[PDB]
Design a protein around this ligand. Sequence first.
Ligand SMILES: C[S@@+](CC[C@H](N)C(=O)[O-])C[C@H]1O[C@@H](n2cnc3c(N)ncnc32)[C@H](O)[C@@H]1O
Ligand SMILES: [Zn+2]
Ligand SMILES: [Zn+2]
Ligand SMILES: [Zn+2]
Ligand SMILES: [Zn+2]
Ligand SMILES: [Zn+2]
Ligand SMILES: [Zn+2]
Ligand SMILES: [Zn+2]
Ligand SMILES: [Zn+2]
Lengths: 470, 809
Amino acid sequence: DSAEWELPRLRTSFIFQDDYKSQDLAEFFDVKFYPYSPPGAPPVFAATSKKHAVICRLTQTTDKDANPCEIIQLIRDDGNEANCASCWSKDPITDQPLLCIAGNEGNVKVYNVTEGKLYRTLVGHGGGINDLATSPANPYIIASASDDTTIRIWSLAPEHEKQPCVCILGGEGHSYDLLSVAFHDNGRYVLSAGHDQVINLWALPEFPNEHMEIPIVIYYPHFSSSEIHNNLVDCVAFYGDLILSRACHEDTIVLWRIEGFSSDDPIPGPLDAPTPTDMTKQTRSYFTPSRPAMFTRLAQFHTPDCGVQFFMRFRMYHVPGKHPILAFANAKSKTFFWDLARFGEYARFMADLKEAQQSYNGRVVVVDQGQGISLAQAQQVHGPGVGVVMKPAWLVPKGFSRETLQAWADMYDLSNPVGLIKAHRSLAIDGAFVGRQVGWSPEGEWCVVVGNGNRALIYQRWGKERGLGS
Amino acid sequence: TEWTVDKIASALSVLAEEVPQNHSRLVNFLLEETEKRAPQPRHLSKTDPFAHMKSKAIDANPEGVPTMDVKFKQHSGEYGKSRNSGRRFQYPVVCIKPDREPVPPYRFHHAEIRKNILALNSQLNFVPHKIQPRSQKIAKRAQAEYAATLAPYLEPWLRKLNIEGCTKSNLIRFMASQPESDDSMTPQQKSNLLDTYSDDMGSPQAVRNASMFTEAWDRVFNDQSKLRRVALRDILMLDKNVEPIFDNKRAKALMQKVIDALGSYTTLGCLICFSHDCEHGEIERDNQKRCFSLEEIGGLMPSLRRKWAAQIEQRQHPPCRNECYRIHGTPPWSENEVGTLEWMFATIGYSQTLRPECFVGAILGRPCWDVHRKLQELDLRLPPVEPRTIPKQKSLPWYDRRKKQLMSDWADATITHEHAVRELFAPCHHDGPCTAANGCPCASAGTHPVLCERFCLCTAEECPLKFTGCACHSSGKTCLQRQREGRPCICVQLNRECDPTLCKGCGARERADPENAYDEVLHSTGCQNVALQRGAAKAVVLGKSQLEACGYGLFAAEDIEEGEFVIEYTGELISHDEGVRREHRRGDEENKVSYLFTLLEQEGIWVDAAIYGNLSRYINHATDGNIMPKIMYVNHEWRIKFTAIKDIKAGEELFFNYGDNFPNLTKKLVERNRPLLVPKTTQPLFDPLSKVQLLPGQPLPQHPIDDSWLLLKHRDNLQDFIDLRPEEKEFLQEWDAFILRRHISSEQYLPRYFLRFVREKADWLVSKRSRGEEFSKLVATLLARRVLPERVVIEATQVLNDARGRLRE
Ligand SMILES: C[S@@+](CC[C@H](N)C(=O)[O-])C[C@H]1O[C@@H](n2cnc3c(N)ncnc32)[C@H](O)[C@@H]1O
Ligand SMILES: [Zn+2]
Ligand SMILES: [Zn+2]
Ligand SMILES: [Zn+2]
Ligand SMILES: [Zn+2]
Ligand SMILES: [Zn+2]
Ligand SMILES: [Zn+2]
Ligand SMILES: [Zn+2]
Ligand SMILES: [Zn+2]
């Protein structure tokens, strides 16, 4: 019953041989779970180091001492490129999994991972690539963010084999190295960000089902702002239609929204974008419906001890029927989780309790939920004279103490956009660790964090372990 | 009832409590909505593609294969206690090599432009690792965001407090009267507020209430111990009727009626390219634009007066199909309808072969005898223009404008040909001769005199400095650098290209027309000094430079004989300081990559090809180059041409000696305390857009130029003027979108392009009356400058009369 609310815990960790030797400055920069397996299949993720792609499958176990992580394919980039970015795709003919790997020479390598061969290379960027993402609407469409300050959109569909760059996000919207690229779930809006502290939202056209001699070039993003953060931005993503983004020296993940943006509206076209007619405007928006405001900061998840580190990435688990979980690892050996559904449940609990405090002038009894006891059996143990409020079990103390309320508000109060929401679970990592990337399995029972020293931390929830097996 | 600062402050604190409450409600609402809209997973395979693959861990019971180690620990419990020290396993490695090398490196998307474009000055907001201290950056942003949060609450709270005189408009009036609004506001701003608000604030109590409300708000919300804090003044500045007064995006007896009627067109209309937002003009430090327009040479009247005087100083056709007054003659008129015939009458002037009647009657849906009736009953009187007498002036010993010839000391007497040392000035618009005494800049602004050019109000009859073009003619090639003809080409001597209008003998008129760019027969004789206007480049191709550790180079794709024009260096035109900010914004050392070409050293204009430009930005440096750049004057634009100095065969890499053409601005600042084929070459060659590798003997890629992004910026630049009514913006934008695509540099081509516009947009022009009225103001302006022939106004009268007759449908 309470299973819906369980957060992960450390289940397995491994260190991969140093492959950038110095003999400790190698890191895993990326991890991604394969997203095209049938429901129920063993989840399979790839962890890309600077020279290797380690592909693992995770299988839950009844033995605490057993190892759920087994490595099924291990690939080395036999060339001179050091890598830091990956994303998954599929063969358009055979439907075999394709792992894309990109790095500092400026090329995307596409690997046929089950057969251990190169599918192809995507050549054309003018500098190192730092992020890749696949379109959730078309598994053959990939976006790449580069030091060359552009995004390129690539297609692996057969009709584009001879020239696979279908779109270039160029122009003047960005002026220095891009570190992050993300697709909206509709496949048509793209977010980009990097060293110039700009977050840009771009609207993709539909791409012809046929050979394109040249890419469609896009010269203006539809939303642009350098004012949501005050530092370099290294991670950006959509959460539905809201934006999550992270910047260096700020120790926060920011949740915010573009005013007037809705993915239910028709996709605007390229001649609808705003152009920079005023050079003192650091925000501009096609979407804007006294002076408006083109964005609104909503909340800040507190992400302490990232220091001056950057290129550190969060990941939200967002799946129908399950709770949305935000996970991020900092630079001082900590991994953070927030279950976004606790926010609504806390606010219901506080409105129910503040209500009974007036309606019964204080004679109010608080009973935990997740018991055999319901707001009915609890009411029969008293009557009409005293109010019974149901408190979520995961709401634990320290009437309730000042310090108990302040500790609950610190984790679940959403009333201040400039506040800091403390992580709902904070797990410590042995030794000195800097997180680079987080990935979730399809069913959300596994969460993998990878970072420096070629380390992977594998968290699990809903395990099936039963009673030791040494 | 009777309030105090304390009582209202107290009340604001209680109202302020609804702000966090609403915020929590909103974020929770949006979080719930987003959770509900979670995406179903897509493109699932029907089988697990990894199902057949087993653990590659090596058994104690792999020879020659590379191997990597992995050490696993298992964890349990709440704090992640490890079960033991871990276990290590050996794994074979699959080594996969890439099949393709990256393209040479580059920064930004390099896009093609047909001509130079004019840039705005950017701010230095980011420097890879003049500027505002980041602390002020951070703090203003916090306050901006808080002000935006609080702004929507002020009217609801005012309505609930309901205090006499606490009105959004009375609070704006009080703010304007406080001393802070001298060190926040300048004259004409207070004048614009006083237009909408005035100074009376009501009763004594109304004035006392507003002052107490302001104090009480700045006490509650502007407590300076906080970073997040807003003064009420900062919220009122956001108000939709206050903000525009602090937005400087502003374009600007009988005759001053007309003057004001054509102000938009006299102010914005470009003299060179006839567009109202374009690439000419000057950008000031705050990015206000001085257009190269009639206002630069004194507005409407100095050119109009001269047209009138030209008209009476010439002393001595089919009637319109709109019930023409010429056959006949003699519904209430709007003031707009009357003004429309006012300015056509004045700008058509003392004409013989053109009368307002027919044309005004084509623009207004009125019959011609109707506007003749209104013409006669209004009896318009022109100012009488004095007989302009031209004072006899001694010719110059270094320049004869009748023989079109330079003579004797000429290179020492003028700086007309020395573009690097020239300072740019608005063309003559004075009365009297072009002398230092009359303040003529052409004569005296610089170290030496320069010739007066086509935009100066002087005439060649009057002015000994006036340029009249070259005298060259030949059934063969002419206007060459050292012509074997008897005397040389003054145009070439002055480092300018021939003028399609003044250079009547050499064929410039036809060869400077881009619509003949690829008539090889035409361009094989006649003037060979119009190549930048011709717009045709030798066939070139991008590739890997032959120089080691150089990135891209440019390669010839067709044989190039020495002396032939090769390509133009195009880019953004920027100021010195914008050049410096750019050298900073991109990083630094002499591993740098400059595309910053010096166009006019002394005036301070550089061409930056780092983002926008053309293939010429890829040409590398050699001391013994095979091409040579040269700054040319081209119809009052300065431009960079490349000419071959050797025979160059197809496949050879182009080089020139950079000289000091690409300066280090900041370092100099600190010191001042037959189809076309891909050629066979050794180097790889690339399509400039796809960076696809090109194969020898395939068609040379030649991609039409994409300008849509540039028409949109120029449209939006007109949309931004708060100075212009929507009817003005509608038409100006329609005309500019058409004329910007034709890249006009000479008035020789305007009548043909004008007639094409009135043909294509005829139906659109008569669909709505403001469009016809605006079209007539443009016509009146071009007629006033004697730049539109009277022949085309008569044809447009037919065209529109026939389009409106087709509308009666
Ligand atoms: C106008 S760009 C030429 C195109 C450049 N090679 C590229 O890949 O984009 C000029 C820059 O190229 C480089 N360059 C050109 N000629 C060179 C030469 N002869 N030796 C070394 N570097 C050169 C320098 O970085 C210079 O700033
Ligand atoms: Zn112009
Ligand atoms: Zn007529
Ligand atoms: Zn003069
Ligand atoms: Zn002059
Ligand atoms: Zn003159
Ligand atoms: Zn000549
Ligand atoms: Zn000439
Ligand atoms: Zn000529």
